[PDB]
Structure formats: C-alpha cells, structure tokens
C-alpha cells in the first residue's frame, strides 16, 4: 500500500543516490561526500553501502584509497559497516586466489591494504594474507604479496616491523633458493627497492585518507581463513514493519553523529 510503495521508493532512490555519491566521493570532497552519505541513511541500506564501497575498491585500482577514506569515516563511527566491507573483501580476495583469479585477488587485496594503512584492518590478517601469498610463490602470488606490500609495506612495518623482517627473509629465501625467473627475481628486487627506499613512494595514507584521531578509530580483526561471511544479501531490500521506529532511531543516530640612509652609507 502507501507504506509499501514508500519503502520501495526509499530503497530505489536512496540506493541510486548512495551509489552516485560512492562513485562521486573525492578528496577535496571527502568529508562532504561522507556527510552526504550520512545525510542519506547509509546504514538503512548498510548492505548496499558495503556493496558500493566494495564495487569502487574493486573496479578502481586508483580509487581504492578513496573508497577507503569513506570506509574509515563510516567505520570509526559504525565499525560494523566497514566490518561487513572487510569480511566482503576477504571473501573476494580468497575468491580471486583460491579460484586463481589474479584480477579479483588484486582488487580485494588492494582494498585490504588500504584498510590496513587506514588502520581499520588488523596486522595478523595482513600477516596471514602475506603468508598465504608467499607459501608457494609463483609469478602470480609473488606479485600479489609484493603488490599488497607496495602500499601496505609501511603500516605492517611501522606497527610490527617483525612482519617486515619476516617478509624479507621469506621472500629472499623463496626467490633465492628456488626456481623462479626474471619475473619474481625483479619482483623481489622491487620489494627490496621499496624497503630500502623507506616506503617513500607509498606512505600509509595520502593527505585526507587519515584524519580520524588516535584511539577514535576502529581496527576490527576478521581474518582470512576464519569462516567469515559476506552478509551481502542486504543488497536486496526488505519489507519493514518497524520502518517508522527504526527510522526515527537511525535518523536520531545520524543527527547525533553528524632617511635614504642605506643609500647614503
């Protein structure tokens, strides 16, 4: 009826606008686009919010950091949101890897590296990802770990240099006592290049991708082989008998959250 048509128009126009803002979010529009994603109730459609974030970080190797800044904004505030996104990107990374999808694995691993540098992803899962990447390194998984480390070699080494030294030992032995070719040879060389360069080509987060304060953040730890879930069926809407109750509640949450003497001488 009227309430039904209202929930349907809500889902439709809301999701379309939130996906617009997902692909629109900028760095000179980081807080603006995040506050527009809040001016719309992004948690009412939390599933398709995780879905827009995931879609951006997957199909954009160059807007993964931007989708990540949005994720950090919404995740220090509603950690479960970036949390669903994190479990999702873990699903997509294990998808790409365990199905031998280089591009899918790379997309999800860039998303997880952005999360680890933003400090929404914990270091033990990054360690497990590097380790399952370097277990039997061939061209693909060697480049996968090295590409992850191209951006996330900084955060792991700054919170736990143990992981950096471990990565150096493992990479050096797996590529220096084993039968790999110029691909993984020059790949190890590139890894050492970033290392010795002191992560100067790729720090943690460029200006505007980390502004949330020291302990005001949320780094939730949901690991790789832990049987996590996507919980992404929330990308399809659902009827609401408590639509008005939860609407007042979530709108209240978004309201509560926002001489001439030199001459002469």
């Amino acid at each position: 009826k009227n309430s039904l048509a209202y929930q349907r128009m809500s889902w439709e126009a809301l999701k379309k606008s939130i996906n617009g803002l997902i692909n629109k979010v900028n760095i000179s529009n980081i807080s603006i686009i995040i506050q527009e994603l809040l001016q719309e109730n992004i948690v009412r459609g939390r599933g398709l919010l995780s879905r827009s974030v995931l879609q951006a970080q997957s199909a954009s190797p160059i807007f993964t950091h931007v989708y990540a800044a949005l994720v950090a904004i919404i995740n220090s505030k509603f950690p479960q949101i970036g949390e669903l996104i994190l479990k999702r990107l873990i699903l997509n990374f294990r998808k790409g890897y365990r199905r031998n999808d280089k591009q899918l694995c790379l997309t999800a691993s860039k998303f997880v590296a952005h999360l680890i540098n933003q400090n929404v992803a914990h270091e033990v899962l990054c360690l497990e990802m590097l380790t399952l990447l370097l277990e039997r390194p061939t061209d693909d998984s060697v480049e996968v770990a090295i590409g992850f480390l191209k951006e996330c070699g900084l955060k792991l080494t700054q919170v736990s240099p143990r992981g950096i030294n471990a990565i150096f030992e493992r990479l050096r032995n797996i590529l220096h006592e084993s039968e790999i070719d110029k691909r993984v040879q020059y790949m190890i060389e590139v890894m050492f290049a970033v290392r010795k360069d002191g992560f100067k080509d790729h720090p943690i987060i460029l200006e505007g991708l980390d502004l949330v304060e020291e302990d005001d953040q949320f780094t939730h730890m949901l690991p790789l082989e832990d049987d996590y879930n996507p919980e992404d069926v929330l990308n399809v809407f659902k009827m609401d008998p408590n639509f008005m109750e939860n609407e007042e509640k979530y709108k209240a949450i978004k309201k509560e959250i926002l001489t001439e003497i030199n001459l002469v001488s």
């Binding site: 150096f168 050096r172 590529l175 220096h176 084993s178 070719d181 050492f192």
Partner: protein, 56 residues
C-alpha cells in the same frame, strides 16, 4: 678497505641482528644452480655421538 661496523641503538636486539642499515641482500641470478648433489635414499646416516659443535 673501508670498514663498516654498525652502531646499535639499544642493547636489546641480538648481537647478530640484521638491521635496516645493511642493504637488503636480495641476490638475484638465473635459474640459480644445481650441484653434483648426492641425493639421499641411497644412504647416509650420522652416528649420534656428534651433535652440532657447540649448540650448548
């Protein structure tokens, strides 16, 4: 021959301890090598009185 003896920061990390200061080895080559490698499964075995010279 220039001497390279690297000052430590703390006493803590071990005597031998690869520090960032040294450049990361990362020795690269072709298919590295193979040897006149005396495979086991013919046989060899260590009479266990000789454990590693000073592991204690």
């Amino acid at each position: 021959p220039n001497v390279v003896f690297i000052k430590t920061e703390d006493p803590d990390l071990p005597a031998f301890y690869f520090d960032p200061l040294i450049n990361p080895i990362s020795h690269r080559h072709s298919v590295k090598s193979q040897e006149p490698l005396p495979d086991d499964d013919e046989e060899f075995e260590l009479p266990e009185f000789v454990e590693p010279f000073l592991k204690d």
